[PDB]
Amino acid sequence: PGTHKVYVELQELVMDEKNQELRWMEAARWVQLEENLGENGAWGRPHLSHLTFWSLLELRRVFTKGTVLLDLQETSLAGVANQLLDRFIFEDQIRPQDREELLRALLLKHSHAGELEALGGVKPAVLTRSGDPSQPLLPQHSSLETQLFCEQLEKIPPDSEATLVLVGRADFLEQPVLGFVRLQEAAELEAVELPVPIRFLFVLLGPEAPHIDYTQLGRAAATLMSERVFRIDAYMAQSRGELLHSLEGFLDCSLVLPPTDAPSEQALLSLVPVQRELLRRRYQS
Template identity: 35%
Template sequence: MMEAVSFEGENDISYEGSESPLPPAFTLSGEREERRCELWTPSVCCSVCSLSPSTGHLWNTNSNAIKRGDAESYVELNELRGEVWQEVGRWVGYEENFSPASGQWGQSHISYLTFKSLIQLRKVMSTGAVLLDIDDSSLSSIAQKMVEELLLKKEIRSSDRDALLAILQRRRSQFDSNSPPSSAGIEMQTFSVAKQRDMVDRVEASVVLSGVVESLQKPVVAFARLRDSVVMDGVLEAPVPVRFVFFLVGPSNSGMDYYESGRAMASLMADWVFSLEAYLAADEKDLYTAMADFMDCSIVIPPTEIQDDNMLKPIINFQKKMLRDRVRPYDTRIMIGGKGLVFSFT
């Protein structure tokens, strides 16, 4: 049976003295922290690198990756509820879900995705709008470009344009840091970024929006990568610079589960390898290939009742092998800058 996930520091949420604006690292009870990457999870800290033939050092032939450095991925999922975008989930490797009814964050856990959500996401992505290296600094202007691209691709009607843009620009409702702790005793309060502002450049965020828009004829999706990550006022619960923006919206009669497909995309963006591939993608094809690679490294559990947790143990070693195969040591696009990117599957 997998050991329980907990926070370092006796669940201390002050984060003083931390080197990151993110919550303290997750650890396994009774395990060393460096073994975190052995977890059965799609969000594994893998690295893709090449060796210099003369020195044996790790090199990066892509100047864009050098500028990005060892940025960690932080993801927020917002679901359209009524007239607002409600923050319902966030990821830093692991997933946390927010309950508006209780006003509390649940306990962190490994993301589990439905096969259907991944298939639906991949299908709709094949016809969606992909904008790479745009130079905007506000979510409003980014949304406008995304909508214009959907119109250009004839994914939406001209009559859909203004209404869709207005929906994307609606107010965001985020977690209140003064809300009471959950019954599990783990307080998942907003990040103490003010105390760690000097380290905020080590984190880059992805904004994921997903929900029902009945006026549309079919589900539509748009993905944008900013040339330079930028802090956007009122977009995230913490002033983390945004690198990626994604939205998936459409009518309820389409058969699409917008929440689960939104979670699937958020889990993709939280995955270190996919996030890096999305960062380095030269075109739409590279993005689709990265999604296929993620799915190839995921595991489907048949709809059979699990009688005992021990039945899941063989999956752990099986996935370790898959993750080893996922590392491509001779990918010449990438150089690993140095610290924080070494991991082990042993």
């Protein structure tokens, strides 16, 4: 009752091919393991969530100055978006001119995998000063997980609550912004098709910047939400400082594996004690 297991969904602002109207569509989901959604429309193989260094860099940077709304007494996604944008303006995260377009982007239709066969496809999109969507200026890199696992719901616990992670690109925004919202009571939103109530909202919006991949940033946020210690801390957090402390503990026990010319598959096994001790340090203090 105090804490629940968390199902995480990552959704990205994308362009559909048939009508060229930008819409929210899920890209990956976390039920104790990450499943990615390919271009064909079938979920890939579940796998352990590996994070890039830059994604964790940017997650820490946007979380340090991030906006958090804890125990927010609201039930609808529109009201939550209104409150988050008001707190964004209060914290100088966004300018008041950005509010109308950010709101109009937040209540777009949240689609799922079932619409991929109906629609022509999905393409990455960037939201402009007006309502028009654009083609991203920075070079496009295909998703690594899509290239690895994609190309070829009964596991959800009954008392689990959902977490929605929304990543979007907006060229008119001055800097990337983080929005973390914990609802006072878990509420069923139209954003998630599943009958799992929503407790947490992750909103990561920003302009195109070097070393910032918003898909990878959303993956890092979702992996952090799927971590047991951070999940408990987010449930019990009463301020942004507790979330930041949990994130520092998360990064202290993260294992960074640098490039090496010879992947032997046996020198990798030499880091089993390292992984065990890092998990011990994460679980103890």
